[PDB]
Write a structure and sequence with these properties.
1040 residues, alpha+beta, twelve-stranded antiparallel beta sheet, 57 strands, 33% strand, elongated, binds calcium ion, binds chloride ion, lyase, lyase enzyme xanthan
Length: 1040
């Protein structure tokens, strides 16, 4: 404390920089690093400008106008300082080196970097790059410095980097710089400010920049970036936690535990055998020195750092996964890249037998927050790269990632034992016009940094192992559009496309494969069981293709391709040359060295201007040629449909079905019906049936109704937002997907046992409280106010400014029917004139909602509407004008009610009529009066009195009160005393009717309570009748 706690931290930090006071120099990995450190230092020492008159310290870092020279100079000084303090270095303790380092620092303090200096040009080098490197130098050289020197150097850093104010990675770097200077300058307040700076980076987010609960990381607002920015956040945070850990300024924020979760959720799934998946690395795929295997290193390092501070369970889990990856790293990618400290940590870990390798990871995971998906199975990994109206196609800024045009066009990455597939200059040689999985216009580009006008991107999953994803492609700046779906099971991936349409006048292509080959480029390509030529230059349009086998450059990397129904597949085996400069021509990364790599490219040609093109193929990784053939003969998958309406695949071994629904209309495929865009997956067993549902559009604020065409006995389990509607004879449920963020909702039904009870019918949830209705669209934000006179004690105050302003709600109409639509409006001196529409159809005329009279509220009848199917409906209220006495165009909406109408409840029974009439005795029909109802009527022929009867049994829709009418054929030969029974709820009534009068009209007999069903009857008897008895029709009319 005041010296020694700082001393302790400083020593801990220095040991991170140089590996510690002592270590095993017989460890060849350590030895190689020590040498590398020594050589580098000698390099910059040799090139250093050393004389009093100097104007810079190195020529490659001139001063005055480019602030990069600040960082460059201090990094050079750091390298020298490193060798100076590195145990085992032939330059360790070198006095001349020491003197040159220190003179360099004092020169910088006198000329370039000091408290009060001019911060010309680029801010970053003054506030972050420089201080960061200066901090490190001072850490190493501390004991060799005076207090006055340390004071000066720190005063400069406090000057350029005074407080934390920025966001994302800048904020992190602010925090590191501030924390480390604090430690070096023995300034507790400054260290605490450093510690506090990272808190704002810790919470999860649901939109915009940061980490998402689903594992996504987004940066630059719209880009999948776990491998880019998120990677550097993880690094700095894991380091700050490690340094501060145990100290007075240790990280206490409970959110710090999110950083440990990030590993399980945001990193582990994206590291395949030492390769950080390129689809989450954004623009960084264009950095030659930072290919996927190199990109993985910082994450592995961060995980090791996190294990040193993690709780027991996590530390164990972390060490196990890192060990796994290190054991795979036969060419020492990691060991040759990191500091001695990490070499020590890494080696200790692989030599520790109490830590066992984690092994192969097996899981499926949907990253809905960044339009990504990962399938990890035994033998392969599969990455899926999409974009939507939420996520940009790819990022290209500062002349980086220049050829990334199609990297988000539904691109597929297949990972296997060929660890180098996407490194070893994959990106600088591959034909970027034909990236795997994508559907594109041939040899074209696409505007960068753009989102599509399509929201359908995402998917759902089951058992945490099987998944289905989809993307409605619409190339930006092009007409090209397509529906692409992926179905990922135990050992196959099915890819389907349809609705492929373009008017761009260019041949349209879908890329099945574009694989990098061995150095010969001779990997055997076997097609329909027949070997093709293995020589470079090979090119064919292969028709009637059933299956293909491409042999892997390394055991475990064969790939099979099955083409359901056969396909015309174009093929090309060629050598390709290019340099990284094409992808990245920024100052830092420009590299023009040419490279030549070999590729096998397989694709579909949909031709020019397709109107409704399609494709289907099945990836069969890690299978022999004969196994591939074997699969083709008896496929374990069945494509149920592949159209623009839906795309569905069932794996018949697993009995897992995946379905993508493309339209917001009722749609049926397989056993499943959906009334909304949805991604759905089912798992069936002997004892149960499970369904997974998601809204990939992420913009449904209402419900999704699902039917499953199979009988269930009851419920086993369900997520919250599921509402079971029926078990038998068919499964019925709905999902409330408002604010879903594209996540998945699951329900599991029982198929055996004794049937339980079906759920009771779900009546219309009247009233629909405005204050609690999900809003689907609006022009002006409404506010809820409290009011004891309002339904639910709350009303919704519209703030509508002008004509055509609207608010559109989503209501769950749980029972199909024709309903009269009413709304309860609270009195307000500011009440406009509104027009209701439902689903784009106006209902009724516009209603002037203003009034001056006494009452606090009124019930407006907007009008009638027919809801043919149960589900969500959009009720829109549009400002159309205003009463002259109104303040403006606002409104105080309390609720909606849907009331039934005669259309639903009124019942008519004619004498014929095939159902509802049962006669007794012989009745005679005729057409002779036109006293109405139907063609004919019947009569008893004035004979067989007290023997005959006609019983009208109506089907009462809803229990309630019903007016009972009757019509008949009147004349003069009719009976005047026709006895009529009305059997209703509660008993039976009897009256006589005079049928020689009031014919042709509906005659009110009475008004009674009836139960829903057929327990009520209206009988006409003939007992004691003084004339002809006519039977025609009855009509029940509900009241009110
Ligand atoms: Ca700052
Ligand atoms: Ca490696
Ligand atoms: Ca299978
Ligand atoms: Ca065919
Ligand atoms: Ca979202
Ligand atoms: Ca407005
Ligand atoms: Ca209300
Ligand atoms: Ca009739
Ligand atoms: Ca009788
Ligand atoms: Cl010199
Ligand atoms: Cl130089
Ligand atoms: Cl940033
Ligand atoms: Cl409220």
């Amino acid at each position: 404390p005041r010296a020694d706690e700082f001393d302790t931290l400083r020593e801990k930090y220095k040991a991170m920089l140089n590996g510690g006071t002592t270590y095993n120099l017989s460890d060849p990995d350590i030895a190689a690093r020590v040498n590398a450190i020594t050589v580098t230092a000698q390099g910059y020492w040799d090139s250093m400008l050393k004389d009093p008159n100097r104007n810079r310290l190195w020529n490659d870092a001139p001063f005055g106008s480019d602030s990069t020279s600040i960082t460059t100079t201090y990094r050079h000084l750091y390298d020298m300082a490193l060798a100076y303090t590195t145990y085992g270095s032939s330059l360790q303790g070198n006095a001349a080196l020491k003197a040159d380092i220190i003179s360099g620092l004092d020169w910088m303090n006198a000329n370039q970097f000091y408290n009060g200096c001019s911060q010309y040009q680029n801010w970053w080098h003054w506030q972050i790059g420089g201080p960061m490197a200066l901090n490190d130098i001072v850490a190493l050289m501390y004991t060799e410095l005076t207090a006055t020197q340390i004071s000066n150097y720190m005063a400069a850093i406090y000057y350029t980097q005074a407080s934390v104010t920025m966001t994302g990675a800048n904020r992190l770097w602010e925090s590191q710089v501030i924390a480390i200077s604090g430690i070096l300058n023995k300034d507790s307040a400054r260290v605490a400010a450093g510690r506090d700076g990272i808190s704002a980076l810790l919470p999860y987010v649901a939109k915009g920049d940061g980490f998402y609960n689903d594992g996504s990381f987004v940066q630059h607002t719209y880009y999948a970036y776990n491998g880019g920015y998120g990677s550097e956040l993880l690094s700095g945070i894991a380091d700050l936690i490690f340094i501060l850990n145990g100290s007075s300024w240790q990280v206490t924020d409970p959110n710090k535990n999110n950083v440990y979760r990030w590993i399980y959720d945001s990193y582990e799934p994206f590291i395949y055998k030492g390769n950080l998946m390129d689809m989450v690395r954004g623009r960084e795929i264009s950095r030659h020195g930072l290919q996927d295997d190199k990109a993985a290193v910082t994450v592995m390092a961060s995980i090791i750092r996190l294990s040193q501070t993690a709780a027991s369970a996590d530390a164990t889990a972390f060490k196990r996964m890192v060990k796994y990856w290190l054991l795979l790293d036969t060419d020492k990618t990691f060991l040759k890249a990191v500091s001695i400290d990490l070499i020590i940590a890494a080696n200790q870990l692989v030599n520790d037998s109490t830590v066992t390798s984690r092994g192969e990871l097996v899981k499926y995971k949907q990253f809905s927050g960044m339009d990504r998906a990962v399938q990890l199975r035994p033998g392969f990994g599969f990455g899926l790269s999409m974009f939507s109206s939420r996520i940009g196609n790819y990022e290209s800024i500062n002349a980086e990632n220049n050829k990334g045009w199609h990297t988000g066009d539904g691109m597929t990455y297949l990972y296997n034992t060929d660890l180098s597939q996407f490194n070893d200059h994959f990106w600088a040689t591959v034909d970027n016009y034909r990236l795997p999985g994508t559907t594109v216009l041939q040899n074209t580009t696409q505007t960068a940094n753009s989102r599509s006008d399509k929201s359908w991107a995402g998917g759902t999953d089951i058992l945490g192992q099987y998944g289905v994803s989809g993307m409605e492609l619409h190339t930006v700046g092009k007409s090209l559009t397509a529906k692409k779906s992926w179905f990922m099971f135990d050992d196959e991936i099915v890819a389907l496309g349809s609705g492929i349409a373009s008017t761009d006048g260019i041949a349209t292509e879908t890329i099945v494969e574009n694989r990098k080959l061995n150095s010969s480029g001779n990997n055997a390509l076997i097609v329909n069981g027949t070997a093709k030529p293995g020589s470079l230059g090979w090119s064919e349009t292969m028709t009637g293709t059933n299956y293909i086998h491409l042999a892997g450059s390394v055991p475990g990397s064969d790939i099979g391709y099955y083409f359901p129904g056969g396909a015309a597949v174009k093929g090309l085996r060629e050598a390709r040359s290019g340099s990284w400069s094409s992808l990245n021509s920024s100052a830092s990364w420009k590299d023009s060295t040419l490279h030549t790599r070999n590729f096998m490219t397989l694709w579909f040609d949909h031709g020019m201007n397709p109107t409704n093109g399609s494709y289907s193929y099945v990836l069969l990784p890690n299978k022999t040629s004969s196994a591939v053939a074997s699969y083709a003969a008896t496929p374990q998958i069945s494509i149920l449909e592949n159209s623009s309406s839906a795309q569905a695949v069932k794996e018949t071994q697993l009995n897992v079905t995946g379905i993508n629904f493309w339209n917001d209309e009722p749609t049926t495929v397989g056993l499943v019906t959906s009334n909304r865009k949805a991604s759905v997956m089912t798992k069936e067993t002997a004892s149960d049936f499970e369904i997974s549902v998601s809204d990939p559009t992420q913009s449904n604020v209402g419900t999704i109704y699902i039917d499953v065409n199979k009988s269930a006995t009851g419920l086993i389990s369900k997520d919250n937002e599921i509402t079971v509607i029926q078990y038998y004879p068919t499964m019925k449920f709905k999902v409330n997907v408002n604010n879903s963020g594209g996540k998945s909702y699951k329900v599991k039904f029982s198929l055996t046992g004794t049937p339980g009870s079906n759920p009771s019918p779900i009546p219309i949830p009247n009233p629909y409280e405005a204050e609690a209705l999900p809003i689907n669209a609006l022009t002006d934000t409404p506010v809820v106010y409290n009011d004891a006179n309002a339904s639910g004690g709350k009303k919704l105050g519209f703030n509508n400014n002008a004509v055509d302003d609207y608010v559109e709600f989503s209501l769950d109409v749980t029972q199909p029917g024709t309903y009269d639509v009413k709304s309860r409006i609270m009195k307000s001196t500011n009440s406009g004139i509104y027009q209701l529409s439902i689903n784009g159809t106006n209902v009724g005329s516009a209603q002037d909602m203003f009034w001056t009279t006494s009452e606090l509220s009124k019930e407006f009848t907007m009008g009638s509407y027919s809801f043919t199917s149960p589900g969500s409906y959009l009720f829109r209220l549009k400002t159309t004008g205003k009463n002259v006495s109104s303040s403006g165009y606002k409104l105080m909406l309390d609720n909606f009610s849907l009331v039934s109408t005669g259309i639903d409840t009124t019942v008519i029974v004619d004498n014929a009529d095939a159902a509802g009439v049962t006669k007794v005795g012989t009745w005679t029909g005729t057409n002779t009066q036109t006293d109405r109802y139907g063609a004919d009527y019947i009569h008893d022929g004035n004979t067989g009195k007290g023997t005959k009867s006609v019983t009208f049994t109506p089907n009462v829709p809803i229990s309630g009160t019903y007016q009972v009418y009757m019509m008949w054929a009147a004349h003069t030969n009719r009976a005047t005393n026709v006895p009529v029974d009305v059997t209703h709820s509660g008993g039976t009534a009897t009256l006589n009717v005079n049928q020689q009068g009031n014919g042709g009209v509906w005659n009110l007999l009475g008004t009674y309570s009836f139960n829903a069903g057929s327990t009520g009857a209206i009988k006409i008897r003939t007992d004691a009748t003084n004339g002809y008895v006519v039977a025609d029709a009855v009509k029940l009319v509900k009241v009110p």
